[PDB]
Design a protein around this nucleic acid. Structure first.
Ligand SMILES: [K+]
Ligand SMILES: [K+]
Ligand SMILES: [K+]
Ligand SMILES: [K+]
Ligand SMILES: [K+]
Ligand SMILES: [K+]
Ligand SMILES: [K+]
Ligand SMILES: [K+]
Ligand SMILES: [K+]
Ligand SMILES: [K+]
Ligand SMILES: [K+]
Ligand SMILES: [K+]
Ligand SMILES: [K+]
Ligand SMILES: [Mg+2]
Ligand SMILES: [Mg+2]
Ligand SMILES: [Mg+2]
Ligand SMILES: [Mg+2]
Ligand SMILES: [Mg+2]
Ligand SMILES: [Mg+2]
Ligand SMILES: [Mg+2]
Ligand SMILES: [Mg+2]
Ligand SMILES: [Mg+2]
Ligand SMILES: [Mg+2]
Ligand SMILES: [Mg+2]
Ligand SMILES: [Mg+2]
Ligand SMILES: [Mg+2]
Ligand SMILES: [Mg+2]
Ligand SMILES: [Mg+2]
Ligand SMILES: [Mg+2]
Ligand SMILES: [Mg+2]
Ligand SMILES: [Mg+2]
Ligand SMILES: [Mg+2]
Ligand SMILES: [Mg+2]
Ligand SMILES: [Mg+2]
Ligand SMILES: [Mg+2]
Ligand SMILES: [Mg+2]
Ligand SMILES: [Mg+2]
Ligand SMILES: [Mg+2]
Ligand SMILES: [Mg+2]
Ligand SMILES: [Mg+2]
Ligand SMILES: [Mg+2]
Ligand SMILES: [Mg+2]
Ligand SMILES: [Mg+2]
Ligand SMILES: [Mg+2]
Ligand SMILES: [Mg+2]
Ligand SMILES: [Mg+2]
Ligand SMILES: [Mg+2]
Ligand SMILES: [Mg+2]
Ligand SMILES: [Mg+2]
Ligand SMILES: [Mg+2]
Ligand SMILES: [Mg+2]
Ligand SMILES: [Mg+2]
Ligand SMILES: [Mg+2]
Ligand SMILES: [Mg+2]
Ligand SMILES: [Mg+2]
Ligand SMILES: [Mg+2]
Ligand SMILES: [Mg+2]
Ligand SMILES: [Mg+2]
Ligand SMILES: [Mg+2]
Lengths: 206, 146, 64, 118
RNA sequence: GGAACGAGGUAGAUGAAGAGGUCUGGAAAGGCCCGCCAUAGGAGGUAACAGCCCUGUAGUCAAAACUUCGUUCUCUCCUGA
RNA sequence: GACCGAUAGUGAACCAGUACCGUGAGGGAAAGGUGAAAAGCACCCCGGAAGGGGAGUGAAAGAGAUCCUGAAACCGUGUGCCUACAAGUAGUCAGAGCCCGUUAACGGGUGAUGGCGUGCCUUUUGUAGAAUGAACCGGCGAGUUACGAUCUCGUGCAAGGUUAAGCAGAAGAUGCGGAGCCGCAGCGAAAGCGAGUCUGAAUAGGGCGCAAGUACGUGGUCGUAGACCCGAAACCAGGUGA
RNA sequence: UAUCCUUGGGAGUCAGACUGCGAGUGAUAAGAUCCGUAGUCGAAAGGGAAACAGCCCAGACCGCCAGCUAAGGUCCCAAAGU
RNA sequence: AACAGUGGUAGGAGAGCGUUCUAAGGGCUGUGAAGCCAGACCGGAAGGACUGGUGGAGCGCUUAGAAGUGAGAAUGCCGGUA
């Protein structure tokens, strides 16, 4: 669909036409949900462990004879009902990652991109060239574009000055065109793409 | 979508059943295992196909046959699949594999005679059924053994 | 790990087009003096695994 | 993540103990016996809400019988006579009159006697 | 076996911006109203929760000595159809 | 770090492989928290001291040394109602009297007396059971995870569906990667033939076929793993002891 | 009258008890034992049979200080006929 | 709306309550967080508030996610105390 093409300063320099196959689809809310869960699951480190009765120190001998003492029968001081005993089940190191079908991955990214167009949270820029890598300048540009809350800045190639300038601002992430992902798109309110980046995204997705 | 208003597809996710969490659940105490016996025990139950010492089914019945070491299985292609191609196309095994009419080649391509063919094709294949070779030739084509 | 096929069963049974198990008959080894020709003709042919048995053994041939 | 037992256990058990206030000795103090007694109290309360309706009807009949016999009728004949007269005043109300307004009760008893003496 | 050159390791150095006002308070890092820095909004500390108080952080520097890696020369060795 | 937070997490947050136990090999604990700062209570008083009451410090001392919080069992002091003719699974429903006054409700406490009423759990044909288990209170304490299988549901794509290792990339998403896997064709022991095929001498008859899957997710169940938790007597290996 | 069948997922059960009726075993004993048949218990509280799983009556979603009945009852305990 | 139904062990099925952690959003809190104590409040249940006291720094709520997710019994284990 058609959107306003801005500059760094915040003046409108005509209207770019986005690819309707990428930016104009009906968002599939079920695949977006699946894509978010999957991505959040993939971030999990899963480094958790407990000692079962075998792994707890000691506990080899039978605490006391089977019969005659008047006590409950016990096999080990580290049996799970004992204080200081092994855990039954409990966490073990594991991955939480899984892969959705590639077509579902594509539909998820197109859905959230096309959702940003519907919500009018897509700011297509002519270019984003910070001369000096300065955070004050990046902050001024974002005020210039009325970007109050969070924002994902999307450059075509790895822009050093933009990446450095935005690094320290809370809630402002910078990615290349290839580094766009569902979770980053959905988590940031505004999506600031350059014209070069939009072309690079449309190359892959369409 | 919003991260603060996520919702799964209806019927995509159920709550897991947790046994042995009190009587109200209906799987309290015995955890749905009933009372006593081998099936209620931890690690319990007999191995698959065990009939409590009655001679098992598999063991009552005879072994049959052998596996041929040199068995050829062909990637079969019915006539209805060949209708996808336009007239004048030399339908080779490489073309069928590249277009994805067949997924794997195996011993080779056999053309079989289910469905209709209404395309003049130079079908090149390892094998043909009698009816397939007829149907290719009948509609102007050339069945070629390769 | 991967579930192991019951190899004894894989040598006796075979899956049909609609997912039934084809089987041979028992009583087809010896002692043919003690069986009628009618019995022998019928035991020669193949049969299906019954519903009750199929429930018991289906997973043992899952990989086939 | 680990879930400690935490506060849920104390909260649940304490509510049972507050329901057991006034019970004797350990039955208001200790969770296990308080729990049993609160449960038993439930069975009894359910049963007795039913028995209450039996016990009050029994009480009203006794009082109607006493008042009837002051008017020279048994309860059996009074109720027969009231049924024949088509008086549909229930036993609660008849027993209320028997205590509170015996002259009104006597009129109803006279109405019953009129039907019986037919 | 030696030298030279480069990049690391084993100590460190430098390092932007608010005691802003006011309100509660034992104390302000908190509230309210205002600034400012940011290649630094990692973190820990500080009388309650601190980018701007301290130790720091980003960035940029630094080694007498021992040590690791690389490179070049030296050095050493050597006909293959 | 969708790991633990002092019965957890290492056996060990603390002078722990210590103390303690054992001839020895060997077994193997318990035990964290004053305060922002010691400003760690000068001085007076009772007491031999301990301990306390003032005073002072502090935001707080009912933060004063196993000194943050401080549950329950358990032990006490005070007293509103009841209680010395009563037969009690201890309540419940009915109910005066007396004493109160609330999250203000056809309220709260107590309970003379009346009716009814043999705890809970387990295990059983059947248990108030003179079967089992629990002194009480607190904490801890049991269907899990991985990889396969299968079914239901969901989603994507659909006669197709899907990549694995790996490479690049935050330990990420994702891109690339089609090797491989399942399905679209079956029948037959097999050669093989193929909408059929096998049996058979047979155009016969009969068997099995003909006339939506797949990738991923949640859930149910199954397999292999200790596989819901606790429990033997024993077996074997290497040591330690006259 | 509203069940029934088929396919697939998940079970539990394989100690039963008494009562009536029909039989065996026994001694035409057993609260015995073993079948058949129906019920109840099991897994069913309520009313009756003093008390009393299995008998008689009857199936408790919850509330009521309404009413009619069942078995069983109506002198007093104890509701209703001296 | 009408009509009918709603005892239940093993067991199947469904709908929910609460706990810790995470994400996102939105809040509370030294003008007093969690915890603890008390109450005559609210919901069909699991449970949830409100008020006051103690406490002295953290914690809800919404939606989704993940589980060391719920104890009264194991002659259970440890502690305390009868
Ligand atoms: K079950
Ligand atoms: K320990
Ligand atoms: K008292
Ligand atoms: K009583
Ligand atoms: K005994
Ligand atoms: K046929
Ligand atoms: K599908
Ligand atoms: K599954
Ligand atoms: K299992
Ligand atoms: K019988
Ligand atoms: K409080
Ligand atoms: K558990
Ligand atoms: K116990
Ligand atoms: Mg061991
Ligand atoms: Mg442990
Ligand atoms: Mg059940
Ligand atoms: Mg239980
Ligand atoms: Mg049991
Ligand atoms: Mg049994
Ligand atoms: Mg069983
Ligand atoms: Mg033979
Ligand atoms: Mg924790
Ligand atoms: Mg607990
Ligand atoms: Mg009644
Ligand atoms: Mg400095
Ligand atoms: Mg100031
Ligand atoms: Mg504080
Ligand atoms: Mg603690
Ligand atoms: Mg420890
Ligand atoms: Mg010694
Ligand atoms: Mg205090
Ligand atoms: Mg403190
Ligand atoms: Mg304390
Ligand atoms: Mg007296
Ligand atoms: Mg007397
Ligand atoms: Mg017995
Ligand atoms: Mg006794
Ligand atoms: Mg026993
Ligand atoms: Mg005992
Ligand atoms: Mg206990
Ligand atoms: Mg031996
Ligand atoms: Mg020796
Ligand atoms: Mg010696
Ligand atoms: Mg029987
Ligand atoms: Mg008997
Ligand atoms: Mg019969
Ligand atoms: Mg039973
Ligand atoms: Mg029944
Ligand atoms: Mg009865
Ligand atoms: Mg009775
Ligand atoms: Mg019973
Ligand atoms: Mg009547
Ligand atoms: Mg009477
Ligand atoms: Mg029911
Ligand atoms: Mg009913
Ligand atoms: Mg279930
Ligand atoms: Mg907490
Ligand atoms: Mg409060
Ligand atoms: Mg648990």
């Amino acid at each position: 669909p058609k959107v306003a093409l801005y500059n760094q300063n915040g003046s409108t320099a005509g209207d770019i036409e986005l690819n309707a196959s990428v930016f104009g689809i009906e968002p599939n809310e079920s695949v977006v949900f699946d894509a978010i869960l999957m991505q959040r699951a993939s971030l999990r480190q899963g480094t958790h462990k407990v000692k079962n009765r075998s792994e707890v120190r000691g506990g080899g001998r039978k605490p006391w004879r089977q019969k005659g003492t008047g006590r409950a029968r016990q096999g080990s001081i580290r049996s799970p009902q004992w204080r200081g005993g092994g855990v039954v089940f409990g966490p073990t190191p594991r991955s939480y990652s899984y892969k959705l079908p590639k077509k579902v991955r594509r539909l998820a990214i197109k859905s959230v991109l096309s959702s940003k167009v519907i919500d009018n949270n897509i700011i297509v820029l002519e270019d984003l060239t910070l001369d000096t890598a300065k955070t004050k300048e990046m902050a001024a540009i974002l005020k210039g574009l009325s970007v109050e809350k969070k924002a994902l800045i999307v450059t075509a190639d790895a822009n050093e000055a933009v990446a450095l300038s935005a690094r320290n601002i809370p809630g402002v992430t910078v990615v290349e065109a290839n580094g766009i992902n569902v979770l980053d798109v959905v988590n940031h309110e505004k999506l600031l793409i350059t014209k070069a980046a939009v072309e690079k995204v449309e190359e892959v997705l369409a | 979508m919003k991260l603060h208003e996520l919702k799964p597809s209806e019927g995509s996710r159920k709550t897991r059943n947790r046994v042995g969490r009190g009587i109200g659940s209906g799987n309290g105490k015995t955890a749905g295992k009933g009372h006593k016996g081998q099936n209620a025990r931890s690690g319990g139950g007999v191995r698959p196909g065990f009939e409590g010492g009655q001679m098992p089914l598999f063991q009552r019945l005879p072994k049959r046959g052998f596996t041929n070491i040199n068995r050829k299985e062909y990637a079969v292609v019915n006539l209805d699949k060949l209708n996808g191609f336009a007239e004048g196309t030399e339908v080779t095994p490489e073309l069928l594999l590249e277009t994805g009419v067949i997924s794997k080649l195996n011993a080779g391509v056999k053309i079989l005679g289910n469905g209709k063919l209404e395309k003049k094709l130079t079908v090149k294949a390892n094998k043909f059924s009698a009816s397939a070779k007829e149907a290719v030739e009948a509609a102007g084509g050339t069945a070629e053994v390769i | 790990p991967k579930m192991k096929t019951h190899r004894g069963s894989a040598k006796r049974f075979k899956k049909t087009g609609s997912g039934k198990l084809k089987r041979s008959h028992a009583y087809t080894s010896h002692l043919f003096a003690n069986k009628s020709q009618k019995q022998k003709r019928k035991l020669r042919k193949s049969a299906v695994v019954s519903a009750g048995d199929f429930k018991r053994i289906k997973q043992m041939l899952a990989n086939i | 993540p680990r879930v400690k037992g935490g506060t849920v256990t104390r909260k649940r058990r304490k509510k049972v103990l507050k329901l057991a206030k006034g019970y004797f000795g350990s039955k208001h103090t200790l969770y296990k016996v308080a729990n049993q007694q609160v449960m038993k109290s439930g069975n009894y309360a359910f049963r007795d809400r039913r028995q209450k309706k039996r016990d009050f009807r029994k009480l009203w009949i006794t009082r109607i019988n006493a008042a009837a016999r002051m008017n020279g009728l048994s309860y059996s004949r009074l109720m027969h006579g009231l049924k024949l007269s088509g008086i549909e005043v229930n036993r609660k109300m008849l027993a209320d009159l028997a205590v509170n307004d015996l002259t009104a009760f006597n009129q109803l008893a006279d109405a019953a006697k009129a039907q019986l003496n037919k």
